[PDB]
Structures are given as C-alpha cells and as structure tokens.
Amino acid sequence: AAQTNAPWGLARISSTSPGTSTYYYDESAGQGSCVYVIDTGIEASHPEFEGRAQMVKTYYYSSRDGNGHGTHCAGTVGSRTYGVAKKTQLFGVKVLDDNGSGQYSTIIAGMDFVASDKNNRNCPKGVVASLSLGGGYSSSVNSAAARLQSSGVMVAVAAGNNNADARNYSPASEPSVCTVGASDRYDRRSSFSNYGSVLDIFGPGTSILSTWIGGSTRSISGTSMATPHVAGLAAYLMTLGKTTAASACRYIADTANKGDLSNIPFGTVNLLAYNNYQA
Numbered sequence: 001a002a003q004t005n006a007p008w009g010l011a012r013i014s015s016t017s018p019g020t021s022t023y024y025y026d027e028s029a030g031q032g033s034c035v036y037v038i039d040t041g042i043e044a045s046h047p048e049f050e051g052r053a054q055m056v057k058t059y060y061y062s063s064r065d066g067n068g069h070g071t072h073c074a075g076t077v078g079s080r081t082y083g084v085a086k087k088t089q090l091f092g093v094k095v096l097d098d099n100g101s102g103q104y105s106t107i108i109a110g111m112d113f114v115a116s117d118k119n120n121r122n123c124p125k126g127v128v129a130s131l132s133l134g135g136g137y138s139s140s141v142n143s144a145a146a147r148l149q150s151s152g153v154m155v156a157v158a159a160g161n162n163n164a165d166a167r168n169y170s171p172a173s174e175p176s177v178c179t180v181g182a183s184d185r186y187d188r189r190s191s192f193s194n195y196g197s198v199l200d201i202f203g204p205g206t207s208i209l210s211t212w213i214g215g216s217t218r219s220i221s222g223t224s225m226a227t228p229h230v231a232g233l234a235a236y237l238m239t240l241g242k243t244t245a246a247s248a249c250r251y252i253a254d255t256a257n258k259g260d261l262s263n264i265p266f267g268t269v270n271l272l273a274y275n276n277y278q279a
Contacts, residue, residue, distance in 0.1 A: 001027045002279065007082055008185045009204030009229055014275045018187045024279045026240055030085025033235040034123035035077045036114045036153070037130050037228070038107075039070030042092035043048060046071065048079035048211045053090035057113050059106045066098030068213040072220060073132045075211030076228035077235070082210040084216070084232025084275075085239070088128075096133060104170075107133065108144040110161060115151035119177070126238035128243050130231035131157040131171060132224035140171040145171035154245040156180055156221035156231040160194035160208065173198050178249035179236075182206060182226040183272060188262045193223055195268040200249050202261055203229035203273045230273050237275070 010023035028038040032210065036056075043065050044053040053074055055063035065071045066248045070092065078088040094201035095110035096102040111129070118127045129148055134157065135141075150157040155177035166172040172179050172194065179198050182190035182205020189195070190205045203226030209219040210228075234248040243251035264270045 001025050001029070004254060007209045009208050010084060012204050013084065013229055013233060013273050014277050018185060025236065025275060025278050026114060026277055028239050030078060030232065030235040030239045031125070032125035033085065033128065033239045034089045034091060034118065034121050035085065035128040035130055035231055035235050036091045036093055037070055037077060037112065038093045038095055038110050039073055039132055040067040040084035040098060041065035041070045041094035043071045043213045044092065046211050046215055048075055048081055049090060050080055052078060053092065054093065055092040056117060056144050057110065058094035059067045059109065059243035060094060060097055063092065065096050065213050067100050069100055069132070069224065070094065071213050073130055073224060073228040075226060076176065077130055077232040084229055085235040085270040088232065088235045089123070091241060095180050099275040104135065104138055104141050108141060111144040111148045114153060115148045118153060126154065127152065128154045128156065128230050128235045131155065132227045134158050134160050134169050134172050136170065137168050139247040142174035145174040146176045149176045152245050154234045156227050158227045161192040161194055161195055161222050164194055165196035166194040166198050167196050169194065176246050178225060178230060180227045180230045182223040183261055187260050189264050190221065192221070193199040195265045197267055199268050201230055201253055201256060201269070201271050201273055202226065231272050231277055
C-alpha cells in the first residue's frame with residue numbers, strides 16, 4: 001500500500017532517506033493487533049479512527065480526552081490518515097487528567113490494568129502499549145513498566161523532552177521497555193529529545209500531524225509523538241509475524257536506519273525506526 005502526501009513521520013518510517021512524502025506499508029496494516037494508548041484518553045468518535053478506537057479505562061470523572069494529547073498519540077498509532085498501523089485496535093487508558101498530569105500511582109495502576117486487560121481483548125497478532133508520558137525517576141513506575149513488558153505487551157515509552165540523559169526519568173529509564181527518542185524531518189535529534197544509553201530507538205518527533213480533540217487535527221512536537229510511531233510500528237510488525245512483543249524493540253533496532261541521525265550524543269544509539277517494507 002502507498003499513502004501519498006502522508007505526514008513526514010509516516011513517510012520517514014518507510015524510507016531509507018528523509019525528505020519523502022509517501023508512506024509505504026503492507027496492507028495488513030496491523031490488523032489483528034492491539035495498541036493501548038495510556039494517556040489522557042482518546043476521542044474514539046473521531047472519524048479518523050473508523051470505529052477502531054475505544055476507551056477501556058479511566059481513573060477520572062470522565063474517560064473523554066479533554067486535552068488532545070492522547071487523541072494525538074492514538075492517531076499516530078492507527079488513524080487511517082496519520083497512523084502507522086491503520087487497521088490496528090486502539091484501547092484508551094486515561095491515566096492523565098485533562099491538564100496532561102497524573103499521579104505516578106494512577107499511572108502505575110493503568111499499566112497493571114493493561115497487563116490484565118489484554119486477556120479481555122482479541123489480539124491474535126499481539127499487544128502493544130504506548131506510554132507518551134513520563135516524569136522524574138521512580139523505581140515503582142519503572143517496575144510497573146517492566147511488569148507490563150513481562151506480561152507479554154510490547155511497551156514503548158517516551159525518552160522525555162528535557163534534552164538530558166533519560167536515566168533520570170521514568171518509565172524512560174526502565175531497560176526492559178522500548179525508550180523512544182525524537183527526531184525531526186531533517187534527520188536531526190529533536191532539540192528537546194532526551195538521550196543516553198537507555199534509549200532504544202528514535203522516531204519522528206518534531207512537528208507531527210495527527211488527530212486532535214473536537215474531530216480536528218494539529219501538529220505538535222515531543223518524544224510523546226515519536227513513541228506512537230514505534231508503538232504503531234511494533235503492532236504493524238507483529239501482525240506481519242516478523243517479531244513478538246518480547247522481541248519487537250530489539251527487532252526494530254536491528255532493522256532500523258543506522259547512523260542517519262545528526263546531533264546524537266556519544267553513547268546514544270543512532271537508530272531510526274524503519275518498517276523495512278519493500279513495495
């Protein structure tokens with residue numbers, strides 16, 4: 001399949017080179033897989049989700065995304081126009097309030113929910129969790145992320161938007177999960193993107209167009225935007241039978257675009273997510 005005039009992020013993950021605008025992907029498109037978007041909620045009624053997104057859990061008075069951040073991340077995972085896995089199933093776990101904030105304890109409960117809720121969902125191709133959140137270092141948030149990874153879910157978390165080493169941030173510093181940094185359309189590390197030895201992969205992070213609340217769209221930046229690229233990429237790759245939940249992050253790194261990014265600090269992987277699709 002070929003999506004012309006796609007967002008630059010989608011075209012980048014299917015390209016050996018930057019500066020293209022067509023997204024190529026196997027038409028399976030993550031069908032039969034699931035991606036949990038653990039964020040502010042998803043506006044599931046957005047026409048871009050085609051009835052494939054739904055709220056499965058909230059810890060607040062409403063499961064509605066009064067923010068837009070979670071809708072934007074879910075749209076990058078699997079919206080028909082802005083998603084990587086355009087046929088995946090999107091499950092919303094609202095752990096962040098409408099201001100984008102949330103207690104670590106609520107975030108931890110949401111991660112343990114997904115580790116159990118996947119046994120209530122039909123995901124024959126496997127389960128992914130996209131965590132476009134993060135804060136200061138916490139061994140309890142990291143361990144919660146390690147449990148979600150251990151339970152059979154491919155966990156992708158943002159490196160952080162502090163332009164520092166991601167070792168001081170959770171769940172970014174959890175080694176067992178996929179810690180995703182951010183890059184821009186010119187194959188530069190995003191100026192805000194965290195780095196370090198804990199980073200596993202880079203995805204498109206700067207000026208990412210995706211869905212927004214109110215049935216709209218907008219372009220925002222963040223490692224919170226690159227994580228749904230890798231999360232949707234994982235789901236796309238598990239549907240194709242190319243990898244599993246336990247080996248997806250390692251697989252994405254093995255098959256990634258190597259040494260194409262600039263301003264990657266010494267000691268950080270120079271790897272860009274790449275779907276390796278040959279049309």
